[PDB]
Amino acid sequence: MEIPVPVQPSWLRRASAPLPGRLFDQRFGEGLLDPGHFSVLLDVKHFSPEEIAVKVVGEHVEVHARHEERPDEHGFVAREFHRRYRLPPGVDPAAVTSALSPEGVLSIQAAPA
Amino acid sequence: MEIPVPVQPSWLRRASAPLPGHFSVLLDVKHFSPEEIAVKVVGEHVEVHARHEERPDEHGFVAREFHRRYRLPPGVDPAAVTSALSPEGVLSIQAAPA
Amino acid sequence: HMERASLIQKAKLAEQAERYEDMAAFMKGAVEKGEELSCEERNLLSVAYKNVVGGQRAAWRVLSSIEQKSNEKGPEVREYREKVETELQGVCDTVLGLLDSHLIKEAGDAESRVFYLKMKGDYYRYLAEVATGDDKKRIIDSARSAYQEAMDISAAAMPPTNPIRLGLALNFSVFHYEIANSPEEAISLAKTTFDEAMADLHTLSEDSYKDSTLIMQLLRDNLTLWT
Amino acid sequence: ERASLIQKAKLAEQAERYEDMAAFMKGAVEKGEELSCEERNLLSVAYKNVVGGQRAAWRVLSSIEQKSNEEGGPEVREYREKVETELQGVCDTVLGLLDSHLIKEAGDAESRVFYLKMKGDYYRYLAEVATGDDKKRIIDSARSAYQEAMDISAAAMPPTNPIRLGLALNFSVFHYEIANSPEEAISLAKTTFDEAMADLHTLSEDSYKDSTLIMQLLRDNLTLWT
Ligand code: NI
């Protein structure tokens, strides 16, 4: 039993021409420079929304991010990560939503049930 | 007693009313142990392949993998390429001038 | 009456759009209709002008700092600092003009009287931040008088936990420290205001409580910084 | 006089007084000398901040106006019309400076593309708030400025050049949002992005940061549009 969680970009509008950590993967932060709910924050800076997959597999919320070989500051680089979080008992798997901020923060939330 | 000196912290500001050739690279490989990192010289490039199987962490379970590639300048001998991992988790790949 | 209602709606729209110069202009016009302002309207007027003057004050400090550093000089910094300073002075004079010709009255509520007198002290204090000679002395005296009249009313008519009273005591203590160069009076005023506040918090309602508990933290932060 | 106006614009930038910065830059341009790369950027920063503030404000008011045509005033319309008027005046000022002083047949493709993109941008800002036959004229003028700039940039600049990337990004925004051609917008954004990854290694630390930022914007817009 597993349901797919859609990655919706938080930001709406559209970006036009602008005024002109390290090479690691993830965790959480307090800011940018328990009841029957679920709430996690992930740093997915190296991945676009189409390169991130969020699912609810049984008692867990799975995050699968992968990007194929791409150029960077020093050479070429391909990255992949798999994160897993437990889903508390009083949380409906259908209530699990996911959004990606323009800063590259993935938030997976589930309203109290 | 005579004259006190103020313990003014960096935390605050005067609050007012509120509004009503060679090769040398450094890599952060903090999530990987030496046995989980593989450095190779493949032709004109220096390849770094780091992979760790599913492990527990601060929030849940996590498996990671990365592949980095760097160009090897012409006057650099591939046999002169050395790699070391510091206890701080920094991977340094170097090659003495040749 | 219809014109006034429209100007207040436009000021609320300008606030949503974050066009504080427009908001200030609408609020000035609304005040000029001659009706007394409601608590919500007082707050609209205050928000409008504090955002305008706040932007100008923040700008002047940057320029004044460059000007002070570039002396260990180029005429451009002085000329431009003088220009802004002039824009800031005009906004303060506008607020002070509105307060003296329309808002400051001997009737009615102590709340509205303290509110306007604090506002008078504030805008004279902003003028004092950029003033220089004998003019500075006159401005310092005018701010002191407005604040003191407001303090006198608030101590007699408002509880020590009242947020208008707390906000006023905070600003007057900022005035003593920063403008009047009386750090001892500033610390004493801030301590007294804060102390009289904790003892009375239980007498407050959820609405008033949040206002006082915030402002007491500001008094405490300033005391940490000044002592 | 010109040197003083540029110094004052730099002071206004530090003080974040973009209306002042724009006024100093307008005066500096009116002296008649060609702008240096630094000066072009001062002019662009000044007016983009002024117009950007006005555009952000208009959307809030226009959104309230569109929503308040549910549950039940006229003040929103009257005030939206006022701002809109202020925005139109700033765009007309920029467009006037571009046509009477900056847009020239000579010299560098970089400066030519820069000014033609700027012309397309300010016509696009006018199109965001325009309505009838006037809107049609404005859409045509933006399209022409962008196309002339595209032709020059494809022939004279590398695909990783940030002016070229920024131009292609804005023209794709124009196709999607203004000209109602989502297919042309997606196609242009994809092509620009694809031609970019293949050429990134040819860039310097300075140019690389510009292109890598703008490619992320193209990619974000494609995620949003497809
Ligand atoms: Ni390590």
Give one DSSP letter per residue of B33-64, joined into a string: -GGGEEEEEETTEEEEEEEEEEEE-SSSEEEE
Looking at domain D2-225, its CATH class is mainly alpha
- Name the fold adopted by C4-226: Delta-Endotoxin; domain 1 (1.20.190)
- Residue B5 gets which letter from DSSP? P
**Among D21, D122, D186, D217, which would you mutate to test the A interface (most chain A Cβ atoms within 10 Å of its Cβ)?**
D217
- Cα angle D93, D95, D101 (rounded to 5 degrees) comes to 95
Q: What residues contact residue A22 under an 8 Å CB cut-off, 6+ apart?
A: B28
The technique is X-ray
Find, in chain C, the residue whose alpha carbon is nearest to that of D17.
C59
If 0-12 CB within 10 Å is exposed, 13-18 middle and 19+ buried, where does residue A29 land?
exposed
The half-sphere exposure of C194 on its side-chain side, counting CA atoms within 13 A, is 19
Q: Which residue has the tokens 């049930």?
A: A113
CA C176 vs CA B21, C192, C194, C197: distances in Å: 66, 14, 16, 20
Strand partners, A38: A110
Which chain D residues are within 8 Å of A69, Cβ to Cβ? Answer: none
Buried b / exposed e over C140-172, threshold 16 CB at 10 Å, is: bebbbebbebbbebbeeebebbbbbbbbbbbbb
If 0-12 CB within 10 Å is exposed, 13-18 middle and 19+ buried, where does residue A20 land?
middle
Buried b / exposed e over D62-80, threshold 16 CB at 10 Å, is: bebbeeeeeeeeebbeebb
Resolution in angstrom units: 4.5
Count of C-beta atoms within a 10 Å radius of residue C54: 14
For chain B, list the contacting chains (3+ Cβ pairs, <8 Å): A, C
- Whether D41 sits inside 8 A of A20 (CB atoms) is yes
Domains and CATH numbers, chain B: 23-95 (2.60.40.790)
- Ligand 1 centroid, distance to B91 Cα (angstroms): 8
Count of C-beta atoms within a 10 Å radius of residue B44: 13
Query: Residues B60, A57: contact at Cβ < 8 Å?
Result: no
Chains D and C touch (3+ CB pairs under 8 A): yes
Query: Residues B31, B64: contact at Cβ < 8 Å?
Result: yes
Nearest beta carbon to residue B71 from set A75, A82, A86 = A75
The domain limits of chain C are 4-226
The distance of D50 to chain C (nearest Cα, Å) reads 12
- Ligand 1 centroid, distance to A46 Cα (angstroms): 21
Is residue C73 helix, strand or coil?
coil
- Whether D201 sits inside 8 A of A19 (CB atoms) is no
Closest CA to C114 of C155, C64, C68, C58: C155
Token pair recorded at residue D125 = 């800002």
Token pair recorded at residue B63 = 């498996």
Nearest beta carbon to residue A14 from set D177, D201, D219 = D177
Rounded to 10 degrees, what is the CA torsion of C143, C148, C150, C154? 150
Nearest beta carbon to residue B17 from set C51, C167, C225 = C167
- Ligand 1 centroid, distance to C156 Cα (angstroms): 67
